[PDB]
Design a protein around this ligand. Structure first.
Ligand SMILES: CC(C)C[C@H](NC(=O)CNP(=O)(O)CNC(=O)OCc1ccccc1)C(=O)O
Ligand SMILES: [Ca+2]
Ligand SMILES: [Ca+2]
Ligand SMILES: [Ca+2]
Ligand SMILES: [Ca+2]
Ligand SMILES: [Xe]
Ligand SMILES: [Xe]
Ligand SMILES: [Zn+2]
Length: 316
């Protein structure tokens, strides 16, 4: 909408207060004009018609329970935009400052979030498996990273290319969580998953097997559920990424860690310069090796560590 840029205040899903960029024109809208061509947050009103209505508020104060998922979707989209701009010199998901749109309160009791090809969509959860999913910065960044992938490598959402697609979203969701530096970890979704159970998460990158996902290519899922295991076999790549960053010895193979920032550089370059819609895990290894070679040199520790990490998870 046309209006003037303002700054509202509210509380997110976890009860934390934060400032949000809004736009005033009769109402205060969840429209942040400070980033690219805008970040826009919509109310789906418990329905499944998208996007719903641009979120309007009479007073620029967002402290109602119903407001909390919108506050967090809007704020964490901003943090994710900032990560990609400041760390990778990428302007929004298309590289040309495309407007970022999100809808919250999608459906009833909806235990998921997704990128629908055009926008982010967040359920509120059923209150037992999940609380509103925009409360997780890693979840928001995971979703927005799907848009980045779709505009770049284009990894088809099935089988190995789809597991790479998933792992890229988990990797960058985690890197955004570290960038914001509030309770960061290598787990996925811990802030919104299972409010009655402490210490769990949807997936673990450091130990995928903790939540039943493979940590070695010999344990890959080969069936048809979950689009050929895209959220299952992602564990193999998530583990490789974790090892590249943090190091470790896994199935007897030792990996010298190089840190999160270099992990992010290598995988961002692989995603945007080398991967294609049909890339498989072996091709991802090659893309990551080449990316590290471009950035750090063929004799570098960084290249050696990428090779060790893929060796450790059985990907040649
Ligand atoms: C219990 C769940 C939260 C676990 C998992 N989801 C995630 O980890 C995050 N959402 P996501 O990975 O973005 C879904 N996304 C998904 O399933 O893609 C299908 C699609 C294709 C094209 C258009 C619209 C939707 C799942 O779906 O099994
Ligand atoms: Ca209000
Ligand atoms: Ca965390
Ligand atoms: Ca996390
Ligand atoms: Ca939990
Ligand atoms: Xe982005
Ligand atoms: Xe997620
Ligand atoms: Zn995903």
């Amino acid at each position: 909408i046309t209006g003037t840029s303002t700054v509202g205040v509210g509380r997110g899903v976890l009860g934390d207060q934060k400032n949000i960029n809004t736009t005033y024109s009769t109402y205060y809208y969840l429209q942040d004009n400070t980033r690219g061509n805008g970040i826009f947050t919509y109310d789906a009103k418990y329905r499944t018609t998208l996007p719903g209505s641009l979120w309007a508020d009479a007073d620029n104060q967002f402290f109602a329970s119903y407001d909390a998922p919108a506050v967090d979707a809007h704020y964490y989209a901003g943090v994710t935009y900032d990560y990609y701009k400041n760390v990778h010199n990428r302007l929004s998901y298309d590289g040309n400052n495309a407007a970022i749109r999100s809808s919250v309160h999608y459906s009833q009791g909806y235990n998921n979030a997704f990128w629908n090809g055009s926008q982010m969509v967040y359920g509120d959860g059923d209150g037992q498996t999940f609380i509103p999913l925009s409360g997780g910065i890693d979840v928001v960044a995971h979703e927005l990273t799907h848009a980045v992938t779709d505009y770049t490598a284009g990894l088809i959402y099935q089988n190995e290319s789809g597991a790479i697609n998933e792992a890229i979203s988990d990797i960058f969701g985690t890197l955004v969580e570290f960038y914001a530096n509030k309770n960061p970890d290598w787990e996925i979704g811990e802030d919104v998953y299972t409010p009655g159970i402490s210490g769990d998460s949807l997936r673990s990158m450091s130990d995928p097997a903790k939540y039943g996902d493979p940590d070695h290519y010999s344990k890959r899922y080969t069936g048809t559920q979950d689009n050929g295991g895209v959220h299952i076999n992602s564990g193999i790549i998530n583990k490789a990424a974790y090892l590249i960053s943090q190091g470790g010895t896994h199935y007897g193979v030792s990996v010298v860690g190089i840190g999160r920032d270099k992990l992010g550089k290598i995988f961002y370059r692989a995603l945007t310069q080398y991967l294609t819609p049909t890339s498989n895990f072996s091709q991802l290894r090659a893309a990551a090796v080449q990316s590290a070679t471009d950035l750090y040199g063929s004799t570098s520790q960084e290249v050696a560590s990428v090779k060790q990490a893929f060796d450790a998870v059985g990907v040649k």
